[PDB]
Amino acid sequence: NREEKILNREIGFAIGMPVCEFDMVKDPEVQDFRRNILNVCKEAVDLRDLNSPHSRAMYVYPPNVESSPELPKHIYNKLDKGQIIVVIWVIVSPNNDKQKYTLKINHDCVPEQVIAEAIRKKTRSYQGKYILKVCGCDEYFLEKYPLSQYKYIRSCIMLGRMPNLMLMAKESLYSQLPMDCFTMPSYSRKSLWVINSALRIKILCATYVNIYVRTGIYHGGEPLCDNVNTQRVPCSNPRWNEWLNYDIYIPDLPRAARLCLSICSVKEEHCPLAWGNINLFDYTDTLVSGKMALNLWPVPHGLEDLLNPIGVTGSNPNKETPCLELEFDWFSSVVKFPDMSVIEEHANWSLRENDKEQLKAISTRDPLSEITEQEKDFLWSHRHYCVTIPEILPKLLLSVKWNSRDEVAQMYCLVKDWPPIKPEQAMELLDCNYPDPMVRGFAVRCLEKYLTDDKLSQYLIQLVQVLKYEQYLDNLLVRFLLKKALTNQRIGHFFFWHLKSEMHNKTVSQRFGLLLESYCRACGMYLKHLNRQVEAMEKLINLTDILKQEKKDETQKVQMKFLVEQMRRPDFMDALQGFLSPLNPAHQLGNLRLEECRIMSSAKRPLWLNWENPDIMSELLFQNNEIIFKNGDDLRQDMLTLQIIRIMENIWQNQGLDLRMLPYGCLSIGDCVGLIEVVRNSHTIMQIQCKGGLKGALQFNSHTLHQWLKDKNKGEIYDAAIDLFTRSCAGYCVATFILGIGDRHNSNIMVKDDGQLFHIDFGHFLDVPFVLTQDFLIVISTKTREFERFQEMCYKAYLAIRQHANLFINLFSMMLGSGMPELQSFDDIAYIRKTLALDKTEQEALEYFMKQMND
Numbered sequence: 001n002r003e004e005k006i007l008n009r010e011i012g013f014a015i016g017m018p019v020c021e022f023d024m025v026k027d028p029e030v031q032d033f034r035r036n037i038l039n040v041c042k043e044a045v046d047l048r049d050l051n052s053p054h055s056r057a058m059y060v061y062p063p064n065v066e067s068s069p070e071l072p073k074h075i076y077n078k079l080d081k082g083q084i085i086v087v088i089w090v091i092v093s094p095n096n097d098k099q100k101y102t103l104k105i106n107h108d109c110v111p112e113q114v115i116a117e118a119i120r121k122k123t124r125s126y127q128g129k130y131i132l133k134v135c136g137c138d139e140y141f142l143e144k145y146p147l148s149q150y151k152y153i154r155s156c157i158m159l160g161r162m163p164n165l166m167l168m169a170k171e172s173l174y175s176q177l178p179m180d181c182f183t184m185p186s187y188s189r190k191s192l193w194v195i196n197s198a199l200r201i202k203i204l205c206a207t208y209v210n211i212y213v214r215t216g217i218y219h220g221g222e223p224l225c226d227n228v229n230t231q232r233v234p235c236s237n238p239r240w241n242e243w244l245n246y247d248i249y250i251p252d253l254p255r256a257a258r259l260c261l262s263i264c265s266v267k268e269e270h271c272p273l274a275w276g277n278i279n280l281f282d283y284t285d286t287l288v289s290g291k292m293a294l295n296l297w298p299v300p301h302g303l304e305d306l307l308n309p310i311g312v313t314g315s316n317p318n319k320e321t322p323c324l325e326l327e328f329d330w331f332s333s334v335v336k337f338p339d340m341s342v343i344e345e346h347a348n349w350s351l352r353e354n355d356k357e358q359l360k361a362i363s364t365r366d367p368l369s370e371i372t373e374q375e376k377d378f379l380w381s382h383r384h385y386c387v388t389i390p391e392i393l394p395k396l397l398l399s400v401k402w403n404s405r406d407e408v409a410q411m412y413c414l415v416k417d418w419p420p421i422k423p424e425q426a427m428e429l430l431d432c433n434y435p436d437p438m439v440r441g442f443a444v445r446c447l448e449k450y451l452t453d454d455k456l457s458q459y460l461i462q463l464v465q466v467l468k469y470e471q472y473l474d475n476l477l478v479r480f481l482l483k484k485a486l487t488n489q490r491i492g493h494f495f496f497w498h499l500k501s502e503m504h505n506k507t508v509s510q511r512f513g514l515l516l517e518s519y520c521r522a523c524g525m526y527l528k529h530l531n532r533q534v535e536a537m538e539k540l541i542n543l544t545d546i547l548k549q550e551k552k553d554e555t556q557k558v559q560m561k562f563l564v565e566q567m568r569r570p571d572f573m574d575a576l577q578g579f580l581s582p583l584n585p586a587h588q589l590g591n592l593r594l595e596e597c598r599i600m601s602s603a604k605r606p607l608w609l610n611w612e613n614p615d616i617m618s619e620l621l622f623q624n625n626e627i628i629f630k631n632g633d634d635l636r637q638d639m640l641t642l643q644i645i646r647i648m649e650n651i652w653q654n655q656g657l658d659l660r661m662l663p664y665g666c667l668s669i670g671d672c673v674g675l676i677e678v679v680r681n682s683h684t685i686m687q688i689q690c691k692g693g694l695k696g697a698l699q700f701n702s703h704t705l706h707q708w709l710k711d712k713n714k715g716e717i718y719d720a721a722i723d724l725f726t727r728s729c730a731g732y733c734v735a736t737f738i739l740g741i742g743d744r745h746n747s748n749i750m751v752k753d754d755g756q757l758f759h760i761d762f763g764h765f766l767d768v769p770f771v772l773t774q775d776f777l778i779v780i781s782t783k784t785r786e787f788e789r790f791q792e793m794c795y796k797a798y799l800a801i802r803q804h805a806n807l808f809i810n811l812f813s814m815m816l817g818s819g820m821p822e823l824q825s826f827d828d829i830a831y832i833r834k835t836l837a838l839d840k841t842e843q844e845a846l847e848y849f850m851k852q853m854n855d
């Protein structure tokens with residue numbers, strides 16, 4: 001049909017590759033995924049069309065709310081007797097005159113009550129036929145949440161700013177909602193464990209080789225038996241035809257067993273050349289048999305062993321690579337993995353107070369803390385009591401002998417009825433350590449039952465990452481993520497972008513490509529806006545690449561002239577004008593203010609772009625939006641660091657210490673190509689010093705910052721600015737120490753006109769003292785009550801963050817999958833286990849941090 005073809009073209013533009021390439025993939029799992037994934041799209045669409053137009057309006061404009069309605073003590077105290085002052089705006093007449101109405105109302109009021117009191121205050125001079133929009137952006141208060149629970153409202157209460165909302169007729173918004181029509185695509189319409197034998201595989205021959213073959217059987221990262229080296233054969237004739245036998249009975253193979261192979265050379269000096277991984281069982285539970293051709297992958301940098309087990313599974317798309325031919329035993333009939341019923345049958349067939357408290361203390365430990373064989377057998381002998389302390393499930397799982405079908409079946413049974421645990425603890429069961437499908441299903445159930453969409457957006461990147469650890473295209477994790485992304489556009493935006501930002505990686509090009517196909521097919525009208533964003537980023541990448549490639553070594557003004565010339569090309573202006581900000585899709589970006597765009601030139605010619613805000617009430621939020629488009633350096637590290645900083649600020653706020661951090665927006669959109677939010681009214685310390693040097697030929701003294709702030713904050717604003725600086729500074733001190741952020745200096749740090757301090761450009765982390773300039777110490781006031789409160793702040797924040805070491809360590813263990821340089825093995829993560837003194841006690845870690853900050 002016509003709709004099908006147009007949708008195919010748009011989806012191909014959005015994903016990068018055309019839809020027709022997926023059809024030519026003669027892979028049963030690929031077509032089966034493309035077809036079976038559509039049930040999730042159908043569920044999402046039905047949930048959208050369920051409750052008439054309000055359901056769609058909620059799908060497109062979901063509430064940006066905190067997970068808990070309860071306010072911290074200090075946040076509530078900032079309220080006027082538990083109430084908040086709110087300005088509600090109304091546009092009247094065709095001229096659209098803006099009339100404000102100020103109200104003082106209970107912080108826990110529903111938007112309906114707010115609208116009611118607003119109409120009351122307005123008539124002193126309906127029937128719920130209105131809704132509340134945020135003045136200056138496309139965020140809506142469509143749900144009966146308590147106002148204070150909306151992130152915007154809680155932010156206004158924390159910042160002392162006053163919330164400005166616009167009253168808007170509901171019909172005016174529903175008229176702006178397209179009648180979406182998701183069209184179903186055109187591509188939709190035995191022996192068991194009886195084998196009882198040892199596993200053996202024939203390595204046949206290898207092509208495209210320019211030595212021996214090392215192989216092993218693994219369950220996730222652990223080997224189910226010893227590795228087997230084949231006969232060292234000359235590279236001229238890469239023909240082994242050898243048979244490799246392993247110390248593993250065939251039915252003893254767990255469900256997620258994997259064959260990991262690589263080709264090594266010798267000088268003495270063993271060196272890998274090309275690696276590969278194969279699923280012993282396919283997506284239909286069938287045990288693979290017969291001949292099989294696997295194209296290998298190039299080696300990643302800094303590989304310790306001669307094998308890459310943690311690497312993706314599947315044949316290299318580029319078939320012009322090393323190709324290894326293999327042979328698997330073929331028995332009576334097609335072998336399948338047993339049904340859960342046979343598992344339960346074979347499982348049924350197959351205690352002191354001090355010991356229970358020992359189990360509890362074990363569960364308390366952090367993930368990276370190793371467990372001993374004695375402790376493993378101890379947890380296993382007490383596997384049933386561990387159900388009472390559920391958060392020990394990760395270590396219990398780690399204590400299993402996955403090469404024994406008996407223990408595997410009994411653990412399956414224990415999982416089928418295992419109690420649910422917190423999402424922060426359920427994510428630990430999804431990294432590379434736990435490839436078992438039942439464990440991952442339990443974790444996905446925990447997430448589905450106990451994860452708010454706020455917390456989902458807060459951890460969306462880690463989940464998109466752990467997607468790579470999935471044994472098969474079709475699994476419960478991807479279906480959960482896809483349902484949420486197709487029922488919540490705020491989540492689907494960063495879902496799509498986290499996926500697309502890695503389409504360049506042929507390791508996951510297939511998986512993410514198919515997932516993006518399904519999403520774009522079911523996402524609705526937002527595909528047009530995503531396409532406009534993609535074309536804008538395309539033009540920006542073109543301009544940045546061309547800039548350096550052809551004009552790199554010109555002067556600032558000549559590069560500026562060329563940038564103004566090419567940026568004015570109509571095919572370019574149309575592309576970069578009138579679209580949604582990928583950093584925050586609620587932000588419209590209208591026409592470019594070219595007079596305000598420039599090339600920073602600090603590193604790799606970053607672009608500083610400036611758009612007008614076309615919002616009807618842009619002036620009440622910001623009339624201009626600024627973004628740094630950087631094509632050059634990797635921003636994934638920055639994304640993760642800013643996420644962790646936001647989480648630390650959330651912890652501190654919910655624990656009762658107001659250390660205002662600044663986790664500004666940062667989004668990697670492609671191979672080292674990304675965007676960065678621009679914090680208004682912010683300058684680097686080096687900028688302050690240069691502006692305050694007061695001498696063309698003289699150096700720059702430190703005592704300038706306090707003077708600059710006092711100038712920018714005169715009167716009663718002075719103490720407030722000093723407090724803001726001190727608190728934000730203590731927060732960032734503790735953050736940078738714990739995370740081991742790279743070299744700080746006078747331009748890595750920034751301050752705002754009201755005193756807030758923050759950091760930028762997190763080059764390398766996890767590889768130790770703060771700058772603590774005489775500037776900072778003079779702003780705080782060495783021997784004053786101010787510094788006493790400062791040290792108290794720092795110690796309290798260090799303890800608060802030490803209390804969530806499990807969460808932070810799990811976040812890093814999940815990000816391990818992404819090919820980030822400063823994060824390649826658990827050894828890099830151990831730096832946090834160091835700086836937080838996990839193996840020490842509370843008082844011990846307190847003394848440790850005191851001494852570390854004394855230096």
Ligand SMILES: */C=C/C(=O)N1CCC(C(=O)NCC(=O)N2CCN(c3nc(-c4cnc(N)nc4C(F)F)nc(N4CCOCC4)n3)CC2)CC1
Nearest residue numbers: 602603606628664677678679684686687690747760761762
């Ligand atoms: C002393 C005299 C002299 O020679 N000069 C006067 C001042 C000098 C100077 O200050 N140079 C540094 C500078 O002003 N800027 C560079 C940094 N930049 C900025 N960078 C980033 C960022 C973050 N993360 C990454 N990975 N990369 C970058 C960067 F490549 F863009 N982010 C920001 N923003 C600012 C707004 O809020 C959010 C963060 N800014 C600012 C300019 C120069 C001459």
